[PDB]
Amino acid sequence: GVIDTSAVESAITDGQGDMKAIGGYIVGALVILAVAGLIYSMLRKA
Amino acid sequence: GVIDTSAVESAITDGQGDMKAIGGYIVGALVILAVAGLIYSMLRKA
Amino acid sequence: GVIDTSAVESAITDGQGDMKAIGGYIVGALVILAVAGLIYSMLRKA
Amino acid sequence: GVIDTSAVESAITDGQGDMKAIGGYIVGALVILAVAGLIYSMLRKA
Amino acid sequence: GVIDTSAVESAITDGQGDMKAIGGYIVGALVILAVAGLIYSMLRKA
Amino acid sequence: GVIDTSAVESAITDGQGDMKAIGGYIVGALVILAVAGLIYSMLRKA
Amino acid sequence: GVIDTSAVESAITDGQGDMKAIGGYIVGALVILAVAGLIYSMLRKA
Amino acid sequence: GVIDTSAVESAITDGQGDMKAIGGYIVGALVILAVAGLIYSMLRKA
Amino acid sequence: GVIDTSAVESAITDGQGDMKAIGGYIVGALVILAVAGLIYSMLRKA
Amino acid sequence: GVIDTSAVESAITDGQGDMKAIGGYIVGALVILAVAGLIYSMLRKA
Amino acid sequence: GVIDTSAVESAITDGQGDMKAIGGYIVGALVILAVAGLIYSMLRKA
Amino acid sequence: GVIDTSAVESAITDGQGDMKAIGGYIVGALVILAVAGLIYSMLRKA
Amino acid sequence: GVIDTSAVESAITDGQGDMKAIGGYIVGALVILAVAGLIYSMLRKA
Amino acid sequence: GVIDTSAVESAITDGQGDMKAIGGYIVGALVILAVAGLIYSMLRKA
Amino acid sequence: GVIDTSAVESAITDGQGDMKAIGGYIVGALVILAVAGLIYSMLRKA
Amino acid sequence: GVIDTSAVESAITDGQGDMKAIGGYIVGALVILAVAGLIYSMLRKA
Amino acid sequence: GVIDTSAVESAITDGQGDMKAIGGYIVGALVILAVAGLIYSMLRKA
Amino acid sequence: GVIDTSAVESAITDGQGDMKAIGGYIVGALVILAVAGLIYSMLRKA
Amino acid sequence: GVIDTSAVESAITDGQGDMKAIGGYIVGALVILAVAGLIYSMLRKA
Amino acid sequence: GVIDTSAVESAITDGQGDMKAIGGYIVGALVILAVAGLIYSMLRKA
Amino acid sequence: GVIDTSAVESAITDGQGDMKAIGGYIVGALVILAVAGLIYSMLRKA
Amino acid sequence: GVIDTSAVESAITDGQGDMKAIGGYIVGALVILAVAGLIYSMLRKA
Amino acid sequence: GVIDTSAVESAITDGQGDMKAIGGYIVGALVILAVAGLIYSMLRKA
Amino acid sequence: GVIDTSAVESAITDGQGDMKAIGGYIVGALVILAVAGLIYSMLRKA
Amino acid sequence: GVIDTSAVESAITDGQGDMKAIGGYIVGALVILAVAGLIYSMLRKA
Amino acid sequence: GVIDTSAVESAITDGQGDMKAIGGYIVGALVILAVAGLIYSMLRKA
Amino acid sequence: GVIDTSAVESAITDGQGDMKAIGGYIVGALVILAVAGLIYSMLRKA
Amino acid sequence: GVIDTSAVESAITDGQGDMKAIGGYIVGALVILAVAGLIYSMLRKA
Amino acid sequence: GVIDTSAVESAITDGQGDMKAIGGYIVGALVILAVAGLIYSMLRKA
Amino acid sequence: GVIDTSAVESAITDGQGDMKAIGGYIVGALVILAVAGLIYSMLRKA
Amino acid sequence: GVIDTSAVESAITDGQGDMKAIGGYIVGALVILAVAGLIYSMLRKA
Amino acid sequence: GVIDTSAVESAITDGQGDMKAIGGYIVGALVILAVAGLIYSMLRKA
Amino acid sequence: GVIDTSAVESAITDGQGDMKAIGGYIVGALVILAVAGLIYSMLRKA
Amino acid sequence: GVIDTSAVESAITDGQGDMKAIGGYIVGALVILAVAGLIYSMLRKA
Amino acid sequence: GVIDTSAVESAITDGQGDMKAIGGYIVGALVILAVAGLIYSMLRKA
């Protein structure tokens, strides 16, 4: 019921927190990747 | 009987309340996820 | 006997009343659930 | 949840670390390539 | 992660090694070519 | 990688070998040409 | 009869109390589960 | 009843404890996986 | 419960161990591939 | 788990073996190609 | 794996065979060309 | 592969055939040219 | 039964409403993505 | 018995009515979903 | 006794009649359900 | 349902926002690339 | 979402920075090349 | 990104170094050529 | 039993009917998609 | 007892009959589905 | 008493007979079911 | 079932409609692209 | 569906707009290039 | 889209700017060359 | 019990029979698909 | 009592026998299935 | 079971039929494409 | 299945139609290009 | 498909239009060039 | 009564003992399963 | 109870044994698959 | 359990057998492809 | 399994057959192309 | 597969046909060019 | 293909037409030149 469903809101809140964080750090890797492929393209090219 | 069945309406009401709330916050996480995968796609891509 | 069995009809009547009512409100929750899972699917997806 | 999502940050961190490193060394090869093609161009030319 | 990404550095290292080597030997050919065209130019000329 | 890149050295080696050889024989023709034009010049002249 | 049926109200009261409590703590586990599956999804994904 | 329902809280507590722990270690594997696929992507790529 | 959840930690531990190992050896292949494509590029090129 | 993950190491090992081998023989073709284009260049030229 | 990778060696072998052959016959044409341009040069000249 | 590379030999063969032929007929023109310039030189001269 | 099944129609109606809406906004992102990749292609190209 | 079993037919009838109706409206959502994923695919693609 | 047991046959007969009838109409609903889930699957899918 | 689907609109909105932004900055790089290749072409050329 | 997409702007910014820089230094080589071919032209010429 | 792009500057630097050097030595040959044609002109002339 | 199972045949029949129909119309979209990607390929290409 | 148990055999017989029949017609739908997804795959693909 | 209890053995015997028989034929249906679900799985799948 | 499957036809119809439309407008861009690359080729060329 | 597919038309429209614009400005550069090479040709020539 | 495509116009603008500038300065060299060959012609001549 | 469990063996036997058969024919389609994609690749390619 | 409970052991024994047998043959089907899906995967793939 | 599995063979048969057919017609397009790119190459070239 | 696969033939037919048409008109441009480069060659030449 | 492929004809038409036009104006320059070299030849000569 | 209820505690104690034990060993299997699916995922993947 | 729960340990033990074994052999297939896709990639590539 | 899990080993064995075989024959095609693209490259080239 | 995997060998066999055939005929075109460019070179030249 | 690969032979056949034809007509132009340059040489000369 | 290759013949035809025409008019100039140099020779001479 109602109140208990307030706590649902809470844990779901943390959960959303984490998700956006980790999803964040993966993005870190992707950036390093993406960018390393930009350098690889620089060699290919020139 | 009838009246008692009015209270059934009531608790079922709270219950529906919670459900839509929590289902809500999970959606919070999913959004952070979804979106972090959009960034991951941004690296993959570029 | 007969008449008494008319009242049986009556209480069974209320009883059917309640049942369909509560069964109703549970459906309320289920809808909120169902629907929150539709949003969760929206994140999973996109 | 929250804290666990701090560690997500951490491994994603190493991951980004590696990525930028390897992406680095590939760039090493590309440079040697690129440059060897510059010499090949020097012969073609002259 | 981190360490594994140290080995990435290593193989990428050899890879750069080879590249600059082969790119080297191709240059050998190019030189012989280039130079044989210098002789051809010597006949054309004189 | 490294070793494989030793063989690169090898084939590039033969390749340089050929190049300087053929470039050689073309020079043979050029010499005969060059020289036949020297005779043509001898007639023009005298 | 009536009064005795007041105590029925009472024990049923505690009973409802417990139920909502335990049902609570199970939810604790489920959250840890749910959430650990969210991390597992994070690896699968990225 | 009430008290007994306090212990429900307790075991459900441990249970939540474990869940988040194991869910944890699975995440360990997933990370190693995820990350090994990042290296595989590094080869594919370069 | 708690303790049992310590063992969860343990097997999940081995599991993470393996994962990072195999993910490793696949990387071995990828490197040989990647690198063989670097040689193929060397021929294409020169 | 652990041991099984030792065998992962093993097959991944063979796999890396093959890869570097085949990638090798393709290089054979590329060399013949590359080199035949060097002769074609010799005609174009002279 | 290993053995299968022996056959890779084999087909790559034929492939290298062909390549050097065809690259050969093209060279035939180039020679006829090259040489016909040497005659054209003989007319231009004299 | 091998056999297919026998046909490469064949078409390259015709190709060389043509080349030497046409290169031939151009030489025809060049001769008429060359020679007409020899007559022009005869007038200039005398 | 029948009437209750009219309300099913109703909530399913809203549900369809939302779905098409959100599915909409995701499309917004996709467009921005798609289009940003069109610009990336413009650089690659020119 | 028989007649009463005629009414069984009747309520089961409404019930089938509802079912096909609601099942209907859910389909509404699914269509909006399905279709929104078709647009998402349109962005991914182009 | 015997005859009375003939009537047992009779009412049991009607009873079987009803049963198969109602069981019938429930099947009606189930079909509408089943089938609505087939459409839901059609959206999920496409 | 409906309202919740208004928020879907909202997050999808931000999401589209980001996408077009990042897709933007990648374009920044591409421009610098594109343009650096225009200079490289200027040297090649002259 | 929005903010995260501000950081996208940032890394894409550095990325553009690098690109224009490296693209720069390649231009350095090209200039030395270009110019060395201008000297080669000076000899050819005179 | 930025720093990595500092190293781009560096290798591009060496590269420019080499280029201007080799382009240099070719000029050496060209000078010897040019000049030998000046002597050839001296004979033609006188 | 038997007969009732004849009707099973019937509804399953319609069901198969629908399925092949809808599956049909989805194919309609896919064709328009597929084909629009063929045009996109036509631009990419030319 | 025995004989009555012969009739058990009989109704169970019809029952098996129906089951295999209906299970049949559902298969009809599944085939139409399956197959429509094969066409959808044909568009996706081409 | 004893003998009468021999007949108990007898009827219980038939009874066991029937039971295993009917239980048999139900199994017939279950098999047809089970198996029809295997086909349904075949469509789902493919 | 049947009729419902007529509507499947309908929405799938719109869906095909859209698809061919959007796929259309993307083609618009591609044409502008394609064509702008034709102009770029005109400069490269002349 | 249909309408949504009208907006597809719209964004694809802008997209085509941009494309033809940028493709335009690149053409600007190409013209300046092309033309600067015409001047370079003027020096070479005269 | 549209606006973003205004910036495309802008960078393409600078790009055209540079191009015409550099193409300019190369022309400077060409003029000095051209002209130095005019002096060389003056000596040859007189 | 035992014997009845012999028949279990039997039906399970047929069942395995079918499965491998159908799984077979699906493979038929897949082959035609697979192969048609090989032709599509042949066009893409050449 | 005791002895009778020895026979319990016996029938339970057969029962276990059957179970493991049938469970066996189902596994037969599953294998054929599993494996047919492996072939389907082979087509999908290649 | 067995027979039913004969029909599996049958539908899978048609399915394979279609697949190879459609896969066919796509090949038609690819050929027209492929070939139109051969003409485009003819213009590029000459 | 079969028939549906006849329509596959049909759309694939149109598709091939278009392809060869457009591929056609691109060829139109290429011809105008090709030919304009023939005129450019006429000026270069004379 | 067909009609859409009529528009392909149309844009390809304009495209051919432009091409022949621009290719035209370049020819304008070439003529002025060609001709200015004819005057330069007039001075050289006389 | 009381004491007897102490023994209830005792057997319930053993019972809890067993339960946690067996539940344990099942977990053993699940781990082997889980983990074997992790390897299967390793092949799928790589 | 306790002891019986020792045997639970035992069968669960075998069960874990099997699981890890079979999960093993499936891995065998996956390896052959994985690896055959590595060869397919070798052809695609070269 | 154990033994049954020996047979798991067996079928998984065949399965691995097939996989490596088919994966084999696909490689056959890929080789023919790969190689036909090598010839196509031979024409492109020469 | 094994045998089925013999047929895999078979279809893969045909597939390899086709591939080498078509790859063949494309080579036909390439030869005609290649060779027509040899004639174009003959005109350019002479 | 095999037969389909006979048609590959066929279209590749036409394709080779065209190629040699067009390559032909281009040669027509080249001849007119070549020859017009022979006349230009006649004026230059005399 | 074939027919399309008839049109290749056609445009190549016009192209040859033009070429011989323009090559013609250039010859006009050359004649005027040639001849004006004949007059210049007349003055030199006398």
JSON list of N, CA, C and O in Angstrom, two decimals, chain T residues 4-30:
[
{"chain": "T", "resi": 4, "resn": "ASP", "atom": "N", "xyz": [-15.37, -50.18, -15.57]},
{"chain": "T", "resi": 4, "resn": "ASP", "atom": "CA", "xyz": [-15.70, -48.77, -15.41]},
{"chain": "T", "resi": 4, "resn": "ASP", "atom": "C", "xyz": [-14.45, -47.99, -15.77]},
{"chain": "T", "resi": 4, "resn": "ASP", "atom": "O", "xyz": [-14.49, -46.89, -16.39]},
{"chain": "T", "resi": 5, "resn": "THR", "atom": "N", "xyz": [-13.41, -48.72, -15.47]},
{"chain": "T", "resi": 5, "resn": "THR", "atom": "CA", "xyz": [-12.05, -48.31, -15.78]},
{"chain": "T", "resi": 5, "resn": "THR", "atom": "C", "xyz": [-11.71, -48.56, -17.25]},
{"chain": "T", "resi": 5, "resn": "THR", "atom": "O", "xyz": [-10.98, -47.72, -17.82]},
{"chain": "T", "resi": 6, "resn": "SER", "atom": "N", "xyz": [-12.53, -49.39, -17.91]},
{"chain": "T", "resi": 6, "resn": "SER", "atom": "CA", "xyz": [-12.46, -49.45, -19.38]},
{"chain": "T", "resi": 6, "resn": "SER", "atom": "C", "xyz": [-12.99, -48.20, -20.06]},
{"chain": "T", "resi": 6, "resn": "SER", "atom": "O", "xyz": [-12.46, -47.80, -21.12]},
{"chain": "T", "resi": 7, "resn": "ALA", "atom": "N", "xyz": [-14.01, -47.63, -19.46]},
{"chain": "T", "resi": 7, "resn": "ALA", "atom": "CA", "xyz": [-14.60, -46.39, -19.99]},
{"chain": "T", "resi": 7, "resn": "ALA", "atom": "C", "xyz": [-13.69, -45.21, -19.73]},
{"chain": "T", "resi": 7, "resn": "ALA", "atom": "O", "xyz": [-13.73, -44.23, -20.52]},
{"chain": "T", "resi": 8, "resn": "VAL", "atom": "N", "xyz": [-12.93, -45.31, -18.65]},
{"chain": "T", "resi": 8, "resn": "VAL", "atom": "CA", "xyz": [-11.95, -44.29, -18.33]},
{"chain": "T", "resi": 8, "resn": "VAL", "atom": "C", "xyz": [-10.96, -44.17, -19.47]},
{"chain": "T", "resi": 8, "resn": "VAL", "atom": "O", "xyz": [-10.86, -43.06, -20.06]},
{"chain": "T", "resi": 9, "resn": "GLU", "atom": "N", "xyz": [-10.55, -45.36, -19.92]},
{"chain": "T", "resi": 9, "resn": "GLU", "atom": "CA", "xyz": [-9.73, -45.52, -21.12]},
{"chain": "T", "resi": 9, "resn": "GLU", "atom": "C", "xyz": [-10.31, -44.83, -22.35]},
{"chain": "T", "resi": 9, "resn": "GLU", "atom": "O", "xyz": [-9.59, -44.06, -23.02]},
{"chain": "T", "resi": 10, "resn": "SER", "atom": "N", "xyz": [-11.62, -44.94, -22.47]},
{"chain": "T", "resi": 10, "resn": "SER", "atom": "CA", "xyz": [-12.36, -44.38, -23.61]},
{"chain": "T", "resi": 10, "resn": "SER", "atom": "C", "xyz": [-12.44, -42.86, -23.68]},
{"chain": "T", "resi": 10, "resn": "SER", "atom": "O", "xyz": [-12.28, -42.29, -24.80]},
{"chain": "T", "resi": 11, "resn": "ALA", "atom": "N", "xyz": [-12.80, -42.25, -22.58]},
{"chain": "T", "resi": 11, "resn": "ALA", "atom": "CA", "xyz": [-12.94, -40.79, -22.52]},
{"chain": "T", "resi": 11, "resn": "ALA", "atom": "C", "xyz": [-11.58, -40.12, -22.54]},
{"chain": "T", "resi": 11, "resn": "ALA", "atom": "O", "xyz": [-11.42, -39.01, -23.11]},
{"chain": "T", "resi": 12, "resn": "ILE", "atom": "N", "xyz": [-10.65, -40.82, -21.92]},
{"chain": "T", "resi": 12, "resn": "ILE", "atom": "CA", "xyz": [-9.27, -40.35, -21.90]},
{"chain": "T", "resi": 12, "resn": "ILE", "atom": "C", "xyz": [-8.72, -40.40, -23.31]},
{"chain": "T", "resi": 12, "resn": "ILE", "atom": "O", "xyz": [-8.17, -39.37, -23.77]},
{"chain": "T", "resi": 13, "resn": "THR", "atom": "N", "xyz": [-9.20, -41.40, -24.04]},
{"chain": "T", "resi": 13, "resn": "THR", "atom": "CA", "xyz": [-8.94, -41.55, -25.48]},
{"chain": "T", "resi": 13, "resn": "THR", "atom": "C", "xyz": [-9.40, -40.36, -26.32]},
{"chain": "T", "resi": 13, "resn": "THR", "atom": "O", "xyz": [-8.56, -39.79, -27.07]},
{"chain": "T", "resi": 14, "resn": "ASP", "atom": "N", "xyz": [-10.67, -39.98, -26.16]},
{"chain": "T", "resi": 14, "resn": "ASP", "atom": "CA", "xyz": [-11.20, -38.81, -26.89]},
{"chain": "T", "resi": 14, "resn": "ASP", "atom": "C", "xyz": [-10.39, -37.59, -26.51]},
{"chain": "T", "resi": 14, "resn": "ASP", "atom": "O", "xyz": [-10.09, -36.75, -27.38]},
{"chain": "T", "resi": 15, "resn": "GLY", "atom": "N", "xyz": [-10.18, -37.50, -25.24]},
{"chain": "T", "resi": 15, "resn": "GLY", "atom": "CA", "xyz": [-9.47, -36.37, -24.67]},
{"chain": "T", "resi": 15, "resn": "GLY", "atom": "C", "xyz": [-8.10, -36.18, -25.29]},
{"chain": "T", "resi": 15, "resn": "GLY", "atom": "O", "xyz": [-7.83, -35.05, -25.76]},
{"chain": "T", "resi": 16, "resn": "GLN", "atom": "N", "xyz": [-7.40, -37.30, -25.44]},
{"chain": "T", "resi": 16, "resn": "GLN", "atom": "CA", "xyz": [-6.10, -37.29, -26.12]},
{"chain": "T", "resi": 16, "resn": "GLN", "atom": "C", "xyz": [-6.23, -36.88, -27.58]},
{"chain": "T", "resi": 16, "resn": "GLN", "atom": "O", "xyz": [-5.47, -35.99, -28.04]},
{"chain": "T", "resi": 17, "resn": "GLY", "atom": "N", "xyz": [-7.33, -37.33, -28.16]},
{"chain": "T", "resi": 17, "resn": "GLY", "atom": "CA", "xyz": [-7.71, -36.99, -29.54]},
{"chain": "T", "resi": 17, "resn": "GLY", "atom": "C", "xyz": [-7.79, -35.49, -29.78]},
{"chain": "T", "resi": 17, "resn": "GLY", "atom": "O", "xyz": [-7.15, -34.96, -30.73]},
{"chain": "T", "resi": 18, "resn": "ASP", "atom": "N", "xyz": [-8.61, -34.85, -28.94]},
{"chain": "T", "resi": 18, "resn": "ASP", "atom": "CA", "xyz": [-8.86, -33.40, -28.99]},
{"chain": "T", "resi": 18, "resn": "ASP", "atom": "C", "xyz": [-7.56, -32.64, -28.84]},
{"chain": "T", "resi": 18, "resn": "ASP", "atom": "O", "xyz": [-7.36, -31.60, -29.51]},
{"chain": "T", "resi": 19, "resn": "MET", "atom": "N", "xyz": [-6.86, -33.03, -27.82]},
{"chain": "T", "resi": 19, "resn": "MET", "atom": "CA", "xyz": [-5.65, -32.36, -27.40]},
{"chain": "T", "resi": 19, "resn": "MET", "atom": "C", "xyz": [-4.68, -32.25, -28.55]},
{"chain": "T", "resi": 19, "resn": "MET", "atom": "O", "xyz": [-4.08, -31.18, -28.80]},
{"chain": "T", "resi": 20, "resn": "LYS", "atom": "N", "xyz": [-4.55, -33.37, -29.23]},
{"chain": "T", "resi": 20, "resn": "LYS", "atom": "CA", "xyz": [-3.57, -33.40, -30.29]},
{"chain": "T", "resi": 20, "resn": "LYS", "atom": "C", "xyz": [-4.02, -32.61, -31.50]},
{"chain": "T", "resi": 20, "resn": "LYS", "atom": "O", "xyz": [-3.20, -31.97, -32.19]},
{"chain": "T", "resi": 21, "resn": "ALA", "atom": "N", "xyz": [-5.34, -32.51, -31.59]},
{"chain": "T", "resi": 21, "resn": "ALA", "atom": "CA", "xyz": [-6.00, -31.74, -32.65]},
{"chain": "T", "resi": 21, "resn": "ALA", "atom": "C", "xyz": [-5.83, -30.24, -32.48]},
{"chain": "T", "resi": 21, "resn": "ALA", "atom": "O", "xyz": [-5.51, -29.54, -33.48]},
{"chain": "T", "resi": 22, "resn": "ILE", "atom": "N", "xyz": [-6.18, -29.75, -31.31]},
{"chain": "T", "resi": 22, "resn": "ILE", "atom": "CA", "xyz": [-6.16, -28.32, -31.02]},
{"chain": "T", "resi": 22, "resn": "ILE", "atom": "C", "xyz": [-4.74, -27.82, -31.02]},
{"chain": "T", "resi": 22, "resn": "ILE", "atom": "O", "xyz": [-4.45, -26.75, -31.62]},
{"chain": "T", "resi": 23, "resn": "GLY", "atom": "N", "xyz": [-3.91, -28.62, -30.37]},
{"chain": "T", "resi": 23, "resn": "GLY", "atom": "CA", "xyz": [-2.48, -28.38, -30.26]},
{"chain": "T", "resi": 23, "resn": "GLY", "atom": "C", "xyz": [-1.91, -28.23, -31.66]},
{"chain": "T", "resi": 23, "resn": "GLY", "atom": "O", "xyz": [-1.24, -27.21, -31.93]},
{"chain": "T", "resi": 24, "resn": "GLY", "atom": "N", "xyz": [-2.54, -29.01, -32.53]},
{"chain": "T", "resi": 24, "resn": "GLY", "atom": "CA", "xyz": [-2.40, -28.90, -33.98]},
{"chain": "T", "resi": 24, "resn": "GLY", "atom": "C", "xyz": [-2.70, -27.52, -34.55]},
{"chain": "T", "resi": 24, "resn": "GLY", "atom": "O", "xyz": [-1.88, -26.97, -35.32]},
{"chain": "T", "resi": 25, "resn": "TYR", "atom": "N", "xyz": [-3.92, -27.06, -34.32]},
{"chain": "T", "resi": 25, "resn": "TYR", "atom": "CA", "xyz": [-4.34, -25.80, -34.96]},
{"chain": "T", "resi": 25, "resn": "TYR", "atom": "C", "xyz": [-3.61, -24.57, -34.45]},
{"chain": "T", "resi": 25, "resn": "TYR", "atom": "O", "xyz": [-3.38, -23.62, -35.24]},
{"chain": "T", "resi": 26, "resn": "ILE", "atom": "N", "xyz": [-3.21, -24.62, -33.20]},
{"chain": "T", "resi": 26, "resn": "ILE", "atom": "CA", "xyz": [-2.37, -23.58, -32.61]},
{"chain": "T", "resi": 26, "resn": "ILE", "atom": "C", "xyz": [-1.06, -23.52, -33.36]},
{"chain": "T", "resi": 26, "resn": "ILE", "atom": "O", "xyz": [-0.56, -22.42, -33.67]},
{"chain": "T", "resi": 27, "resn": "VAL", "atom": "N", "xyz": [-0.62, -24.72, -33.70]},
{"chain": "T", "resi": 27, "resn": "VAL", "atom": "CA", "xyz": [0.58, -24.85, -34.50]},
{"chain": "T", "resi": 27, "resn": "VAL", "atom": "C", "xyz": [0.43, -24.17, -35.84]},
{"chain": "T", "resi": 27, "resn": "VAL", "atom": "O", "xyz": [1.31, -23.33, -36.14]},
{"chain": "T", "resi": 28, "resn": "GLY", "atom": "N", "xyz": [-0.78, -24.24, -36.39]},
{"chain": "T", "resi": 28, "resn": "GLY", "atom": "CA", "xyz": [-1.14, -23.47, -37.59]},
{"chain": "T", "resi": 28, "resn": "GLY", "atom": "C", "xyz": [-0.81, -21.98, -37.49]},
{"chain": "T", "resi": 28, "resn": "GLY", "atom": "O", "xyz": [-0.26, -21.39, -38.46]},
{"chain": "T", "resi": 29, "resn": "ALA", "atom": "N", "xyz": [-1.24, -21.40, -36.39]},
{"chain": "T", "resi": 29, "resn": "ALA", "atom": "CA", "xyz": [-1.02, -19.97, -36.12]},
{"chain": "T", "resi": 29, "resn": "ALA", "atom": "C", "xyz": [0.47, -19.69, -36.02]},
{"chain": "T", "resi": 29, "resn": "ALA", "atom": "O", "xyz": [0.95, -18.70, -36.62]},
{"chain": "T", "resi": 30, "resn": "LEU", "atom": "N", "xyz": [1.12, -20.53, -35.24]},
{"chain": "T", "resi": 30, "resn": "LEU", "atom": "CA", "xyz": [2.54, -20.41, -34.95]},
{"chain": "T", "resi": 30, "resn": "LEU", "atom": "C", "xyz": [3.34, -20.45, -36.23]},
{"chain": "T", "resi": 30, "resn": "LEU", "atom": "O", "xyz": [4.42, -19.82, -36.30]}
]
